[PDB]
């Protein structure tokens, strides 16, 4: 047969092209799970940054308080140095 | 009559061959459209690999920041302790001076 | 007739191919449903790209802030060393006054 041979060839190409397509979808189905994992990886990093930001803000506030206290203690140390300047050589 | 018997088999098998061809064309079209999308979705395999590495990098950056913040917190706590101790000493010196003036 | 027999046999052959073609069309329909489902991943990957872009800028900012905090702590420690020297001198002066 001349035309039957032409159809068998086209059908074989069809089956082959469909089979190759089905293999790719099975491969791409894994990306659904990998995307779920990455979504959770980002969720975790966002909470780690949330915590770091709180800690850094608290540290900044502590540094500002320490600086202010030290300035006012130095005022008192200088006063004490001047008082002793009047008394002991 | 034997012409009509013949015309019928020619038309029957012709209609079957035409329906086949139209259906094969639909098949090829549907397959071609499907192949275009998979080529497009194959890029996501590489993009997911890049994102995995991007997260791996950010986790190590957070690991380092957490160590640095913990060290800074420890230093602040020690500084606060030292300042509390020095405050006790400044107050004692203030009282000693007042005792000299009141003498 | 030999010819009428081959005309019917090649006709039978095409009906068998039509059945196979129908199996194919069903297999392509199932495949098309999956691609529509996987098209959502294109958007999800775009969202994740942006999520990482945001986290990188948050880390950039934290690193600057932590470096600035570290510098401030080092300066405070250095100033405390000098204040300690002064308190100790004042304590020694007072001990000398009260021992006199
Ligand atoms: Cl201090
Ligand atoms: Cl003092």
Author numbering:
A (entry chain C): 63 to 151
B (entry chain A): 50 to 152
C (entry chain B): 53 to 152
Give verbatim lines from the article.
Mammalian L1ORF1p has a unique architecture, even among the ORF1ps encoded by non-LTR retrotransposons. These domains are first, a coiled coil domain, which causes the protein to form homotrimers, second, an RRM (RNA recognition motif) domain, and third, a C-terminal domain (CTD), which cooperates with the RRM domain in binding single stranded nucleic acid substrates.
We therefore tried to obtain a detailed crystal structure and indeed, a bacterially expressed fragment of human L1ORF1p, encompassing the entire coiled coil domain (hL1ORF1p-cc) crystallized with two trimers (T1 and T2) present per asymmetric unit, yielding two slightly differing structures of the trimeric human L1ORF1p coiled coil domain at 2.65 Å resolution. For the polypeptide chains A and B, all 14 heptads are found in the electron density in a continuously helical, extended conformation. In heptad XII, chain C begins to deviate and breaks the threefold symmetry, and then becomes untraceable in the electron density in heptad XIII. Trimer T2 is highly similar to trimer T1 for heptads II to XI (r.m.s.d. for Cα atoms = 0.781 Å), but, in comparison to trimer T1, heptad XII also remains roughly threefold symmetric. Apparently therefore, the N-terminal heptads of the coiled coil domain are deformable and can switch between an α-helical and an unwound state. The distortion is caused by the stammer, which can be precisely assigned to residues M91, E92 and L93. These three residues form an extra 310-helical turn between positions d and e of heptad IX and create an additional hydrophobic core layer (d*) at L93. Arginines (heptad III, R135) are much more rarely observed at d-layers, and especially the combination with a glycine (G132) in the preceding a-layer, where the guanidino groups of R135 coordinate a second chloride ion, is unique so far to the human L1ORF1p.
